[PDB]
Each structure stands twice: as C-alpha cells, then as structure tokens.
C-alpha cells in the first residue's frame, strides 16, 4: 500500500496532473482498487 499510492502520485505528477483534490484522493485511497479508480478517472479526464 505504502508504495502503489506513492507511485500513483508520482505517475499523476509525471502525467501532468496538478490536482490537490488527485493527491489527497492518492492518500485517501486505502486499496489498490481505489488507487486505480482515482488514477484512471482523472487520467481519463486529462486525456
């Protein structure tokens, strides 16, 4: 958990996502499922 979430935030920052509500919702995610959900959601929006 304390790995996928960090790499998630790094992935978002590298992708070009300046979303505080993104980073917080990264930290708020407690399961890999949620992490993928948040990333996919905002990345889909960003793309």
Curated annotation (Swiss-Prot):
Region GA module, annotated ranges: 1-47
Residues of the full protein shown: 219 to 265 of 387
Function: Binds serum albumin.
Places the protein is found: Secreted, Cell wall
Protein name: Peptostreptococcal albumin-binding protein
């Amino acid at each position: 958990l304390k790995n996928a979430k960090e790499d998630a935030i790094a992935e978002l920052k590298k992708a070009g996502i300046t979303s505080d509500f993104x980073f917080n919702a990264x930290n708020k995610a407690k399961t890999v499922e949620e992490v993928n959900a948040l990333k996919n959601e905002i990345l889909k929006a960003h793309a």
